[PDB]
Design a protein around this ligand. Structure first.
Ligand SMILES: Nc1ncnc2c1ncn2[C@@H]1O[C@H](COS(=O)(=O)NC(=O)[C@@H](N)CC(=O)O)[C@@H](O)[C@H]1O
Ligand SMILES: Nc1ncnc2c1ncn2[C@@H]1O[C@H](COS(=O)(=O)NC(=O)[C@@H](N)CC(=O)O)[C@@H](O)[C@H]1O
Ligand SMILES: [Mg+2]
Ligand SMILES: [Mg+2]
Ligand SMILES: [Mg+2]
Ligand SMILES: [Mg+2]
Lengths: 502, 499
């Protein structure tokens, strides 16, 4: 059985001089012992340069073993980095016929990280797997991090467009999120999430906004205490912020004029749905207006048209979106140069007219449109206006929060607005009550405790500029832009009433 | 003779006919002509760095100061860090003494729309950085101050020396306090730091991530973590995104940053730390030497200082802060000094600040007071406010810090300092799952509760490093302010949860 122990020695071989040797496990320190300094490439650089310094001589490249197929005297490794994959071929006949090198390579587990020294060349029929259409012929291969554990599922299965033709279910993916995020579509999803944050902030900064950061530990709930997480804050009773609502208004009352925040909020929703989470990233805007709050509404509208335009343009966003759609197909998000705006009353009458809703004229003012009904409206507007994006305005005051300013001449109606993507709410906002006495009256009208809101209310007591604002769900915007079926696909480590882990 | 009160409280019912009064915004809409409403920032940038000078204009602002004498009233109008004097001379308003009475009675902080003519006086007053004046033709109040202010903004703007508006008074009245010229400027500079940080990282191929603050197990140690009941699960608030930013690198994202709150149940109430703050976090891979990333983080901060220190807007913001809170300009070198921890301690010993033998240096855990003493030494010897310490003792760093395999008492760790105080802490990470489990055991932590994090290393881990940065601390130390509560909008500390 000594033969088996010699074989074990080969399979476990640690390389001690990478100048003499062509394979083995190596500490990163020992690549310092190389006679030359190493210019190490990643696959993103290779893709963008090739799809001359890369084709001339042997190069060094690092990547994860996405796939490895042993075929006798040949072995085929697909290296992966981000979105990019490249085939690397070990041919024993080109490596002094070293059978132990092949034995060691065949034994490498998937997802292991290797540094390969090899020569790039363009084959006749390139692998259809790899978006790098060159192949590396391996001269040396060293493993700097060996996979230690059997994978919870295969990336080949996890990447598959889900059909009835192995599905990896959501629980398995979320439980092993650090493997799930390696699929091409999931990588692309979160690159796009970052893009949304960048476009949002850059548009606001170009329009003279400053970024603010307001606390999430509160003494009082921001949007209604029933769904606020409670905390013990040094023997005080505290809550997590459901929104930065109170503080962004306080900042406008303090003179900051145009503010935005990109930050977590926490909502103790006791419903476990496909489209909401208990923790999410709110994009909040608050700003003054001159004489009409519609000034700000048109501004928020231009902001979203800009987001859509920027998400839909350029090579890299196009590639990200196409990569998502490869696994999760959906028609491209559509919007108009003139966003359709409907009043709540008009929207109701449209739904009744299309036979989607039945109400007596008596029942129309108090009617509270369901999320399913908002989706039906989305379908109607998609058919009639050829857009996935529109605005509803003038909600009844009774259905909006206490800080929403009502129409002076028609108080049952408020100066409020929701924006919709594919028939689902992405943004909610309103003209704010900017008179401290009207604000106290509305707080009382809503049976809220003004004493507990004193720090907020007092911020209006030394003048208040006319102002409005909005709050936006980042994960929901991304989900609906891509047409994904669940908000857990656009939150990195989702939180819902059952899931605190990972 | 009660018509005087009706004058004082006058509500204007037609702005085309009248020249003063309280008005509803809807009433302004009744103006016969569309109103091009200017703010003081536009006026400053157009005039101080011609439409505004050939006609009556409309301007909105807050009444910062008001004085009247006879036929003249003087209003200082304020917006952001800009102020401009406006003058009512009722010889040019039909000698309407009632207008003078109504205007003179407006309370401070009231928001007014003024229709007037701009002109450049021979002698502009010194306090207004707009060196033009507005001669008032009409003035309407769209929001009247309702309550007496808790302190005068004139007092709150003064350099401290009789008058002093104390910190508790200010923070209990934060939305008034934030109107001082310095405080406005501080939080504009905070936003500048976030912008420069993100743009530098984006230009270097990073992506922004958002990771949860509701956790099943604390990220930096349970003694200082807030607990929460999460649907009858026992959880914590994140003290940092440490576990998740490493998990994102293990997931292949390669270069990530996060700008987000963290929560720390800090044992103490001190001038330089808070219980909630905004952490700027970076995590990235390296090729063969973690020092690659350290030099990168160093370039990031040099870039931040460079952009904060530039001419134009940022220079005016800094000047405005220093007007109330004077401090020497922040200085940094073209090449950042880097000291090992041992070198830093030996510098303290050489200057007589510490007495340690050689065999005691690595066991010594440098206090914040001694870090400050070191900052003074380095300012005197190297003429910089910014430097780096590397190679902290392993036993004094967190469990995820990789030690030097050939001298394990030392770690591949680093802190960055501004004016002698820590702004950044980070390290090469343990990226071998077996070494990670051993170090977790060595720090007597619970591998089972950290299982979701440990498991993220079990399917390979890239060589990687990272860092965490206190946003408010960076701003505080850049400006030389005496308290971190000056650089956090609504501060949280062990006593203060409100506002
Ligand atoms: N549980 C959840 N999961 C994910 N996204 C969610 C969500 N709940 C809401 N959102 C998203 O957050 C947005 C704002 O939340 S909100 O409608 O409750 N409004 C406001 O809060 C006001 N302050 C805003 C203002 O008036 O400025 C929604 O439109 C969704 O996109
Ligand atoms: N209570 C407080 N108030 C304000 N700022 C504070 C603070 N505590 C810390 N900071 C600031 O946050 C930074 C990071 O915090 S830390 O030193 O605890 N390190 C880490 O956490 C690792 N994960 C980082 C890594 O290794 O990536 C500090 O340098 C301070 O500037
Ligand atoms: Mg809704
Ligand atoms: Mg809503
Ligand atoms: Mg320290
Ligand atoms: Mg520290």
């Amino acid at each position: 059985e000594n033969l088996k122990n010699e074989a074990t020695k080969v399979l476990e071989h640690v390389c001690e001089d990478i100048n003499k040797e062509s394979y083995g496990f190596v500490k990163i320190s020992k690549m310092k012992e190389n006679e030359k300094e190493i210019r190490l490439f990643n696959l993103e650089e290779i893709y963008h340069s090739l799809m001359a310094h890369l084709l001339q001589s042997d190069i060094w490249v690092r990547g994860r073993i996405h796939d490895i197929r042993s075929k006798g005297s040949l072995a085929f490794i697909i290296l992966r980095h981000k979105l990019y994959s490249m085939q690397c071929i070990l041919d024993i006949k080109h490596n002094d016929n070293d059978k132990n090198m092949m034995k060691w390579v065949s034994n490498l587990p998937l997802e292991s990280i290797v540094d390969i020294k090899g020569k790039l060349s363009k084959p006749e029929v390139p692998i259809d797997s790899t978006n790098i259409k060159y192949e590396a012929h391996i001269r040396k291969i060293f493993c700097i991090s060996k996979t230690a554990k059997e994978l919870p599922f295969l990336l080949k299965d996890a990447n598959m467009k889900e059909t009835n033709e192995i599905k990896v279910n959501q629980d398995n993916r979320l439980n092993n999120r650090c493997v799930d995020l390696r699929t091409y579509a999931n990588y692309s999803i979160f690159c796009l999430q970052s893009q949304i944050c960048t476009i949002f902030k850059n548009f606001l900064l170009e329009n003279n906004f400053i970024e603010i950061h307001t606390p999430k530990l509160l003494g009082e709930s921001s949007e209604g205490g029933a769904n606020a997480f409670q905390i013990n804050y040094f023997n005080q009773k505290g809550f997590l912020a459901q929104s930065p609502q109170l503080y962004k208004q306080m900042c406008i009352n303090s003179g900051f004029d145009r503010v935005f925040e990109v930050a977590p909020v926490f909502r103790a929703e006791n419903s476990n749905t496909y489209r909401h989470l208990c923790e999410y990233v709110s994009l909040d805007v608050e700003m003054t207006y001159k004489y009409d709050y519609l000034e700000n509404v048109h501004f928020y509208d231009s902001m979203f048209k800009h987001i859509f335009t920027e998400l839909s343009k350029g090579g890299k966003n196009e590639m990200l979106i196409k990569t998502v759609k490869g696994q999760y197909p959906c028609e491209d998000f559509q919007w108009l140069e003139e966003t359709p705006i409907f009043t709540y009353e008009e929207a109701i009458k449209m739904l009744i007219q299309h036979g989607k809703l039945h109400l007596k004229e008596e029942e129309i003012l108090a009617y509270d449109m369901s999320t399913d009904m908002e989706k039906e409206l989305g379908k109607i507007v998609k058919a009639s206006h050829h857009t996935d994006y529109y605005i509803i305005i003038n909600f009844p005051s009774a259905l909006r929060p206490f800080y929403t300013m009502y129409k002076e001449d028609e108080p049952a109606i408020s100066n409020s607005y929701d924006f919709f993507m594919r028939g689902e709410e992405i943004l909610s906002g309103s003209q704010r009550i900017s008179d401290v006495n009207l604000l106290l009256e509305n707080i009382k009208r809503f049976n809220l405790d003004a004493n507990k809101l004193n720090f907020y209310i007092d911020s209006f007591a030394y003048s208040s500029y006319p102002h409005s604002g909005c709050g936006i769900g980042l994960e929901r915007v991304l989900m609906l832009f891509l047409g994904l079926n669940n908000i857990r696909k656009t939150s990195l480590f989702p939180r819902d009433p059952k899931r605190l882990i990972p």
